[PDB]
Amino acid sequence: ATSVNERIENKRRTALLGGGQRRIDAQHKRGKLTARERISLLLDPGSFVESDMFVEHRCADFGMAADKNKFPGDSVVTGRGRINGRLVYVFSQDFTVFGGSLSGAHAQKICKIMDQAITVGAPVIGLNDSGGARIQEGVESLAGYADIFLRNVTASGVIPQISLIMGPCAGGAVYSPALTDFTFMVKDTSYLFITGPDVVKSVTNEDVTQEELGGAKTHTTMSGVAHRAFENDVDALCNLRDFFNYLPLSSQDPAPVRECH
Amino acid sequence: DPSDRLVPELDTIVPLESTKAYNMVDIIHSVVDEREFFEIMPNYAKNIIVGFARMNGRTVGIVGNQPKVASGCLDINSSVKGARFVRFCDAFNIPLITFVDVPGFLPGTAQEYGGIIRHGAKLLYAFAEATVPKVTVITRKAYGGAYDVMSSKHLCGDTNYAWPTAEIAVMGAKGAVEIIFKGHENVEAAQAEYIEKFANPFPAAVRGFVDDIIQPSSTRARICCDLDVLASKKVQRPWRKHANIPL
Amino acid sequence: YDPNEKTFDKILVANRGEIACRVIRTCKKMGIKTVAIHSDVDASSVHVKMADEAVCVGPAPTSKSYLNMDAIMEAIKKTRAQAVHPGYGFLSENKEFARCLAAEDVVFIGPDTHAIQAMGDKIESKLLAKKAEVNTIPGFDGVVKDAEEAVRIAREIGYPVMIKASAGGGGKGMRIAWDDEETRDGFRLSSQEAASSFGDDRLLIEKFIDNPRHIEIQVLGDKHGNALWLNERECSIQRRNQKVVEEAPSIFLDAETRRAMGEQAVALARAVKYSSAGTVEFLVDSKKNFYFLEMNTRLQVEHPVTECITGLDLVQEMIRVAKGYPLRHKQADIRINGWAVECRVYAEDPYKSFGLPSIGRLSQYQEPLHLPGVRVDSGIQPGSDISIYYDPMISKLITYGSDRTEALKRMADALDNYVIRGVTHNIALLREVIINSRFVKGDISTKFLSDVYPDGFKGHMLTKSEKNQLLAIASSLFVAFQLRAQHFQENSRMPVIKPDIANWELSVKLHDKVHTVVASNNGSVFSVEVDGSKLNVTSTWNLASPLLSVSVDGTQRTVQCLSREAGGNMSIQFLGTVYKVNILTRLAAELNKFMLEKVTEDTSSVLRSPMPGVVVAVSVKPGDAVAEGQEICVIEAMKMQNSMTAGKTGTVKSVHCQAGDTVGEGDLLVELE
Ligand SMILES: CCC(=O)SCCNC(=O)CCNC(=O)[C@H](O)C(C)(C)COP(=O)(O)OP(=O)(O)OC[C@H]1O[C@@H](n2cnc3c(N)ncnc32)[C@H](O)[C@@H]1OP(=O)(O)O
Ligand SMILES: Nc1ncnc2c1ncn2[C@@H]1O[C@H](COP(=O)(O)OP(=O)(O)NP(=O)(O)O)[C@@H](O)[C@H]1O
Ligand SMILES: *C(=O)CCCC[C@@H]1SC[C@@H]2NC(=O)N[C@@H]21
Ligand SMILES: [Mg+2]
């Protein structure tokens, strides 16, 4: 008798249920969805293959050596699927686990997915929702950010890249959507800034709130960082599918041709 | 001009306290041959330094920060000013030499309303796309994503060095202490241990993110020998008509 | 340098600069552990790293770092130092320091408290000298209380009489009068200024000596009652009553007068019971008459130059005396061996009032240690900084030789072969003094600098031949740079076709004149024709070394290229002085006549705030006419303090920004120029 089977079920249920039911309820309280159902809505049903499900972070400092600070998946869901029959690679970030802060495993999974996509020659779609770099990791988060930036720069002009912010993205994670071809946001729930309002108050001594500092309207009306805005997530995902129906799979293929009437 | 000339004057140019400012143009004059430096745009966006110089007779590109102006923080103008020069040096096979002293990006409402993200991405892309050999030296400061934007090791950099007074950290010691040990509500000692173990270049050195920690007086010799070695660099990239600059 | 004899094991050096380095050298050569102190600023000095342990003493100002008694007290207690060395200045004269050190267990390297107390005041010193049957300047006895006393005394001593401020000193408080009404107004002025200077208000009347020579006498004593006079010295070239050029052997005096002065100094030292190294100063007139004036109870700054002529180590002997051993020499064991000349290098501008303090950071620093018979005593290294709280002292250059002429030539060569970049120095003045005809002949006095340059120092007046040499050297260097610019590497795709120009026609502008120069290259030899005159300039033509030696018509010259610009401007240091030239081709010179003269009158009155940072403090006082050597204020911004320091003379018409004043960028701070 081996307990290596019930362990698989426990790990799978922990990955599917995220970081707790209370955090999921808080997420739904603000009218914001979860990563797995986002991926299910975006991709065709029955065609999503998940990879790197059992990956865990290797931090051993500031008390995360205990079990209470250990979560499989590490606040990111990656895999491949099909949209209207055409292959695509997609990654989504989970705000439930450590606020979506990026760590070694998170960046490693993204880098592996991007490497597979550039090798095969398929587009990349990213749903960005992260609180920034993991503060306790140290230089590891900086290394992950730099590697992701390098892979974003390398793949530019070879395969299309799309970013879709659904939550508060701050810190150094804001430079990855800026290096992609197109950027979209969601009204009243998505934010994009480098420094928080508290730092603004501390430094320049001028009163400002988060919404006017990094809201969807600010970046979509007179800032030129985002391309379009959507009121909620389902309509945003439907429009993202419609837009992806336009783009070719790679720079080596001609513009798509569809039946006309 | 000998390539192994020592520069003992740099052993104390960096103040021991972290609140004082200094001139990077002095260091640039110290390192380059015959102390000749053709500065580009000297009166525009004075928080960054770009220009043309020679090392062992070979033309090189110089990029660095100016802590005397705006504490060396990056802003909208300096981003494009450095990015265009880096791209031009890339286009014609000119090596790049980098001096890093940055605490982050300039904050406020004007920079965010004006689109600081696009120009930061401009500079980051200009450094990441580089194929010519690059040597980077860290003098005092490297905080946040500015360290990655400033030609870190993970952007296909060649060699990186750090002075003994340098240090690499995610963000400020005070902020890190107040955001990590929130429940403990005791920052009297925690700050002391945090600055004792992380306010030094050792966490980056032990991970291999920087090659060695060198004395400031051997910077010219190290850069000269590295540039001589790295003259035959060739790197291949996937085919494409052109890439997408974030302009 | 015998180490067999047992001496102290640890020594403390409570000073800074070159003297600390010399003391550390002397103790290291004797195999003695050394202890050093330093302020917060001087944490990277040569003397703090050249020693072994270091003990901070306090902040930057000298009132709290080197004059702070308690800090030194715990320094000795922690280091368990068996001895202490004051150097010169600072606490080398304060008697309370000596007594408190000698109280518990610590020996003080210096004179006893009684001797310092005796020769610490100008009134008792002259009385003791008169009791010591040594010659003294005739003058009034006692302190004059009113101008009536002064004038009646002036009846029997004459008009050339100088009213002197009793005690204090520092080259101030001496006023010259020649008339009864002049006497009374000078007495009133001295009485008024005595309170401002020191507050003692005691006044001294003494006969002025016209055209005096300052002859310097060195004496050494012990605790066993033995005194030696180590020849003499002459310190006559002074500005602001401070010596700059010193000569160890005196050319004025003969053996008889030297012996008489030495015997008088030894007798005075015996009367005072001096038991350390000390000095006695005399004034000698034209008629070979000498009078006593002041005794310094400390180590003299001019000790190395009198060590060169005798081969004796003053610090070693003084340390041994402090231990208790008697002297190993006799008065018949001291002889004069050759000649020695010493000049003092200052971080000051010799173009304004014979010297004005300056600040900066040294980028290049090299000493001519490879030249024959050159000794350098410097407490500076490349990368060092010159502050405002201390002496602008840089280095002491000492040369020796078989006679006066060889020593002077060697010192001139060393001055020409000395590299300092970053701060302005007085090397030009020092090199100009030693080549003067009067100084070479030997007719100098305390007022030598006040009459040879009535309008102040202007530089080196170069003759026609020297002007031609300078023009030829500048043209040769310009053509050498132009020729070096054309040496590229092989490309194998587009070969380079070098131009075949033969003769270079140039136009050189020096001062307010234009000279036509024709230059030709024949390998490593240049043929230059300057207005008909023909000269040949040859050298190795190294364009990277700071020092370049050239041969102009056989004569060997050393030049330095301080600055060079593509516009034709060039700064070259020739014969010590810095000359600015403008070199252009004939076509460029002809075309430059069509350029309108650019006028830059500007306003330069309102000093708008460079950045929105808040002015944390304003060190200066409203309404200041200070030219240089001082900053204005410090501005705090973005966790950083930035200072709008100005090296330009800006008159303060009015101060608009005070301490703790918030100002945005573009706001007038202080009305300056
Ligand atoms: C490379 C660039 C850098 O060096 S960035 C340095 C970090 N500077 C910062 O200001 C911290 C970044 N975080 C933020 O700015 C804000 O929290 C933002 C991103 C706006 C999040 O908004 P908000 O929805 O209100 O967060 P929250 O109050 O719900 O917090 C919930 C959990 O999220 C986590 N979180 C957040 N950021 C990080 C981070 N950088 N690293 C690790 N964890 C992070 C928090 O730990 C928090 O957890 P908990 O539930 O309070 O226990
Ligand atoms: N009776 C006098 N007659 C003519 N000149 C005098 C007379 N007394 C002083 N002087 C001049 O004033 C200056 C005195 O200098 P000095 O005796 O060194 O003062 P000091 O400040 O006590 N020196 P020191 O303490 O050793 O640094 C000299 O230049 C003298 O020429
Ligand atoms: C002081 O110790 C640090 C607090 C101020 C933060 C400043 S603001 C701009 C720089 N960017 C960053 O992330 N920290 C720096
Ligand atoms: Mg005197």
**A181 contacts B244? CB cut-off 8 A:** yes
Q: Chain B residues with CB inside 8 Å of C383's CB?
A: 8-13
* Main-chain dihedrals φ then ψ at residue A163, nearest 5 degrees: -120, 140
Q: Whose CA is nearest to atom 35 of ligand 1?
A: A99
- How would you classify residue C142: left for phi > 0, otherwise alpha for psi between -120 and 50, otherwise beta? left
- Cβ neighbours around C494 below 10 Å, total: 6
Resolution (A): 3.2
Question: Which of these, B133, B191, B140, B182, lies nearest to B21 by C-alpha position?
Answer: B140
Structure tokens at C303: 């000790």
Q: Are B82 and B45 in contact, with CB atoms under 8 Å apart?
A: no
Give, in degrees to the nearest 5, the angle at Cα B29 between B26 and B34.
Answer: 150
Residue with token string 């922990």:
A14
Strands (E), B56-108: 58-65, 96-102
- Cβ neighbours around B201 below 10 Å, total: 21
Q: Chain C residues with CB inside 8 Å of B67's CB?
A: 640
How many beta-carbon pairs under 8 angstroms link A with B? 124
Residues 15 through 74 of chain B touching chain C, CB cutoff 8 Å: 16, 19-21, 26, 29-30, 33-34, 67-68, 70-71, 73
**Strands C33-38, C10-13: parallel, antiparallel or unpaired by DSSP?**
parallel
Q: How far apart are CA B174 and CA B181, in angstroms?
A: 11
Residue with token string 């065709």:
A44
- Cβ neighbours around C164 below 10 Å, total: 20
Closest Cα in chain B, distance from residue C487 (Å): 11
**Position C646: which residue type?**
A
Q: Are B162 and B186 in contact, with CB atoms under 8 Å apart?
A: no
Which helix (H) or strand (E) element contains residue C152? helix C147-155
Find all residues with CB under 8 Å of A167, minimum gap 6, and list them. Answer: A32, A95, A100, A128, A129, A130, A189, A190, A191
Helices (H), C68-146: 69-79, 95-103, 113-118, 122-131
Structure tokens at A224: 């030129």
Q: How far apart are CA C601 and CA B237, in angstroms?
A: 57
Q: How far apart are CA B118 and CA B126, in angstroms?
A: 12
Q: Chain C residues with CB inside 8 Å of B172's CB?
A: none
Q: How far apart are CA C490 and CA C494, in angstroms?
A: 9
* β-pair partners for C504: C519
Binding-site residue set of C for biotin: 354
Q: How far apart are CA C225 and CA C229, in angstroms?
A: 14
- The pocket around ligand 3, CB under 6 angstroms, is made up of A 199, 203; B 73, 103-105, 107, 143-144, 171-172, 174-175; C 639
- For residue C614, what is the DSSP state? E
Length of chain C: 673
* Main-chain dihedrals φ then ψ at residue C57, nearest 5 degrees: -125, -15
What was the experiment behind these coordinates? cryo-EM
* Residue of C148, C246, C256, C294 with catalytic role: C294
Q: Are C227 and C219 in contact, with CB atoms under 8 Å apart?
A: yes
Q: Are C90 and C66 in contact, with CB atoms under 8 Å apart?
A: yes
Q: How far apart are CA C110 and CA C120, in angstroms?
A: 14
**A135 contacts B170? CB cut-off 8 A:** yes
b/e for B101-111, b at 16 or more Cβ within 10 A?
Answer: bbbbbbbbeeb
Find all residues with CB under 8 Å of B131, minimum gap 6, and list them. Answer: B90, B233, B235, B237
A60 in contact with chain B, both atoms CB, cutoff 8 A: no
**B180 contacts A149? CB cut-off 8 A:** no
Structure tokens at A190: 């998505």
Q: Are A157 and B241 in contact, with CB atoms under 8 Å apart?
A: yes
Q: Are C113 and C95 in contact, with CB atoms under 8 Å apart?
A: yes
* β-pair partners for B52: B38, B61
Ligand nearest to the Cα of B169, by number: 1
Q: How far apart are CA A105 and CA A94, in angstroms?
A: 13
- Cβ neighbours around A184 below 10 Å, total: 22
Closest Cα in chain C, distance from residue B9 (Å): 4
Residues 157 through 196 of chain A touching chain B, CB cutoff 8 Å: 157-158, 171-172, 174-175, 178-179, 181, 192-195
For testing the chain B interface, which of C363, C561, C636 should be mutated: the one with the most B CBs within 10 Å? C363
- Cβ neighbours around C357 below 10 Å, total: 15
Find all residues with CB under 8 Å of A48, minimum gap 6, and list them. Answer: A39, A40, A79, A80, A81
Structure tokens at A222: 């007179």
Structure tokens at C229: 């006079």
B179 in contact with chain A, both atoms CB, cutoff 8 A: yes
Residues 115 through 154 of chain A touching chain B, CB cutoff 8 Å: 118, 133, 135-136, 138-143, 145-147, 149-150, 153-154
Which helix (H) or strand (E) element contains residue C107? strand C107-108
Where in chain C are the domains? Answer: 4-136, 137-208, 209-446, 447-595, 596-673
Find all residues with CB under 8 Å of C557, minimum gap 6, and list them. Answer: C469, C473, C549, C550, C551, C574, C575
Three-state DSSP at C351 gives coil
Burial of C285 (C-beta count, 10 Å sphere; 0-12/13-18/19+): middle
Three-state DSSP at C420 gives strand
Question: Which of these, C254, C236, C253, lies nearest to C245 by C-alpha position?
Answer: C236
Q: How far apart are CA C501 and CA C442, in angstroms?
A: 53
Structure tokens at B157: 């950099």
- Cβ neighbours around C291 below 10 Å, total: 19
Active-site residue C590, yes or no?
no
Q: How far apart are CA C363 and CA C422, in angstroms?
A: 5
Structure tokens at A187: 């009204």
Burial of B85 (C-beta count, 10 Å sphere; 0-12/13-18/19+): buried
- DSSP collapsed to 3 states, chain A: CCCCCHHHHHHHHHHHCCCCHHHHHHHHHCCCCCHHHHHHHHCCCCCCEEECCCCCCCCCCCCCCCHHHCCCCCCEEEEEEEECCEEEEEEEECCCCHHHCECHHHHHHHHHHHHHHHHHCCCEEEEECCCCECCCCCHHHHHHHHHHHHHHHHCCCCCCEEEEECCEECHHHHHHHHCCCEEEEECCCCEECCCCHHHHHHHHCCCCCHHHHHCHHHHHHCCCCCCEEECCHHHHHHHHHHHHCCCCCCCCCCCCCCCCC
Distance of CA C559 to the CA centre of its chain: 23
Give, in degrees to the nearest 5, the angle at Cα A141 between A135 and A145.
Answer: 135
Q: Are B97 and B89 in contact, with CB atoms under 8 Å apart?
A: no
Which helix (H) or strand (E) element contains residue C307? helix C303-308
- The pocket around ligand 2, CB under 6 angstroms, is made up of C 137, 162, 169-171, 174, 206, 208-209, 212, 241, 293-294, 296, 446
**Position C145: which residue type?**
K
**Position C456: which residue type?**
G
Three-state DSSP at C343 gives strand
Find all residues with CB under 8 Å of C287, minimum gap 6, and list them. Answer: none
Distances (CA, A) of A219 to A18, A170, A236, C325: 31, 14, 17, 87
Question: Ligand 2 mean position to C203 CA, how many Å?
Answer: 15
Question: Which of these, C192, C112, C207, lies nearest to C153 by C-alpha position?
Answer: C207
Please report all neighbours of C, defined by 3+ CB atom pairs within 8 A: B
Q: How far apart are CA A90 and CA C539, in angstroms?
A: 72
Q: Chain C residues with CB inside 8 Å of B20's CB?
A: 641
Q: How far apart are CA B226 and CA B231, in angstroms?
A: 9
Burial of B169 (C-beta count, 10 Å sphere; 0-12/13-18/19+): buried
**Position C457: which residue type?**
F
Q: How far apart are CA B106 and CA B76, in angstroms?
A: 9
Three-state DSSP at C68 gives coil
Structure tokens at A189: 């729930």
**B154 contacts A204? CB cut-off 8 A:** no
Which helix (H) or strand (E) element contains residue B205? helix B202-206
- The pocket around ligand 1, CB under 6 angstroms, is made up of A 98-99, 101, 131-135, 168, 170-172, 196; B 144-145, 170-171
Q: How far apart are CA C478 and CA C541, in angstroms?
A: 11
Q: Whose CA is nearest to atom 34 of ligand 1?
A: A99
Q: How far apart are CA C259 and CA C272, in angstroms?
A: 20
Distance of CA A247 to the CA centre of its chain: 20
State the DSSP string of C485-531.
TT-PPP-SSS--------EEEEEEEETTEEEEEEEEESSSEEEEEET
